[PDB]
From a paper:
Adenovirus fibres are trimeric proteins, which consists of three different domains: an N-terminal penton base binding domain, a thin central shaft domain and a C-terminal globular fibre head domain. Adenovirus infections are usually initiated by the interaction of their fibre heads with primary receptors, followed by internalization mediated by penton bases interacting with integrins. Here we present the structure of the raptor adenovirus 1 fibre head, which does not appear bind sialyllactose, and show that deletion of the beta-hairpin insertion does not significantly affect the stability of siadenovirus fibre head domains. Like the other siadenovirus fibre head structure, that of TAdV-3, the monomer has an ABCJ-GHID beta-sheet topology with kinked C- and J-strands resembling reovirus fibre head structures.
The beta-hairpin arms of the RAdV-1 and TAdV-3 fibre heads (residues 359-NYGLR VVNGE LQNTP-373 and 349-DNIGV IENPT FYRNK S-364, respectively) were replaced by a short fragment containing two amino acids (EF and VD in the structure of RAdV-1 and TAdV-3 fibre heads, respectively). Data to 1.7 Å resolution was collected from one of the crystals and processed. This structure could be solved by difference Fourier synthesis and directly refined, as the crystal form was isomorphous to the non-mutated fibre head. Structure superposition of the native RAdV-1 fibre head and the beta-hairpin arm deletion mutant showed that the main architecture is highly conserved, apart from the mutation introduced. The beta-hairpin arm is replaced by a short loop and the conformations of the BC- and HI-loops are slightly affected. In the trimeric form, the interaction interface of the mutant RAdV-1 fibre head now only contains hydrophobic interactions involving fourteen amino acids from each monomer, accounting for 11 % of all residues. Only seven intermonomer hydrogen bonds are present, although the intermolecular salt bridge is conserved. The mutated RAdV-1 fibre head trimer has a solvent accessible surface area of 16.9 × 103 Å2, with 5.9 × 103 Å2 of buried surface, which means that now only 25 % (instead of 33 %) of the total surface gets buried upon trimer formation. The thermal stability of the mutated RAdV-1 fibre head protein was assessed by a thermofluor experiment and compared to the native versions. Deletion of the beta-hairpin appears to destabilize the structure somewhat, because now some unfolding is observed at high temperature (dotted line in Fig. 3a). The somewhat lower unfolding temperature can be explained by the loss of hydrophobic interaction surface and some of the intermolecular hydrogen bonds made by the beta-hairpin arm, and is consistent with the assembly stability prediction.
Author numbering:
A (entry chain A), B (entry chain A), C (entry chain A): 327 to 450
Write the structure that this text describes.
């Protein structure tokens, strides 16, 4: 009764698992560990300062932003960075995970690994 | 009954809106979107590694720190940075929003835009 | 009844105080202010991108990661950085505070000061 599990599918067919815990008027969502995204999962694979991961699945998830430590692997480099992440729903009802970064690079993302991320808050 | 709205005024006459949600012994405060501060809103407009925004308004707000992604516009540059922010009350009862940054610059702030910020926690 | 106080000891004999607040199924832990660690407190004092602080004390603390602003003093430099921190328990039941950073440096930590840190969440 405390929690529910859910998931999303990425464009490349990856599964993002999460668990939601209701704490009265708020919900805390924790993502599954060892999450890795391919460049193919992003709307654009360019390593921009705003990245969009379109999602599919059964239930919307709309959150405040949370801090993550991510690793971005490009052909030539490895970038280890604190980023902010947020689950948002599009005007077309399409769920997205948005990743906000400090510095745009003219490089293509091969992988993004989430090392660790703070729990996500939603105000229900 | 769950929440209350409040606001602060900045030195330049800007309005910071917020909504507070009580979750038993804690309060979660969410700031209004699209917040932009002028250099004139800071105690000092120099782009120091600690920035202070003095506030006026009806009710104190004292919080733990939260992470934000901010944009700092100076005459010559645009800096997009993760920062920590915290609402604190001064020894004189003056409320402040404090912004803590990584790197002091000898430049004057024209604008600070909050792109996104994690909710603020207070332990009541 | 709302809270409990606890502490850990560091290798150099420093005391980390904390206060835990239960909010139904979650616990919020706030660390004592003015925390300073010596290089001697780390498993390795090299300024790596993952730092481990072994702890002793009466009660495990297992948390999600939280953002901190830290100052790292080395012989030659002062680094002011946002980092993520997390309390984890080892396979041997040894509690650790882990600090995750962006950039490894081939320098020895003299001190790490926590300037400010977001509260820690545990899902009980
Ligand atoms: Cl797409
Ligand atoms: Cl994108
Ligand atoms: Cl966060
Ligand atoms: Cl590339
Ligand atoms: Cl002033
Ligand atoms: Cl200032
Ligand atoms: Cl935060
Ligand atoms: Cl300037
Ligand atoms: Cl050790
Ligand atoms: Cl270490
Ligand atoms: Cl955090
Ligand atoms: Cl050194």
């Amino acid at each position: 009764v405390s929690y529910s599990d859910g998931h999303f599918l990425t464009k490349s067919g990856g599964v993002i698992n999460f668990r939601k815990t209701r704490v009265t008027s708020i919900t805390i969502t924790i993502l599954g560990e060892f999450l890795t995204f391919k460049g193919a999962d992003f709307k654009s694979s360019t390593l921009k300062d705003e990245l969009l991961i379109p999602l599919e699945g059964a239930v919307q998830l709309n959150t405040a932003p949370s801090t993550a430590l991510c690793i971005f692997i490009t052909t030539d480099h490895v970038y280890r960075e604190l980023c902010m992440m947020q689950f948002l729903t599009d005007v077309d009802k399409t769920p997205f995970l948005v990743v906000l970064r400090s510095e745009s690079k003219h490089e293509t993302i091969q992988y993004m690994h989430i090392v660790t991320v703070h729990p996500f808050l939603s105000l229900t």
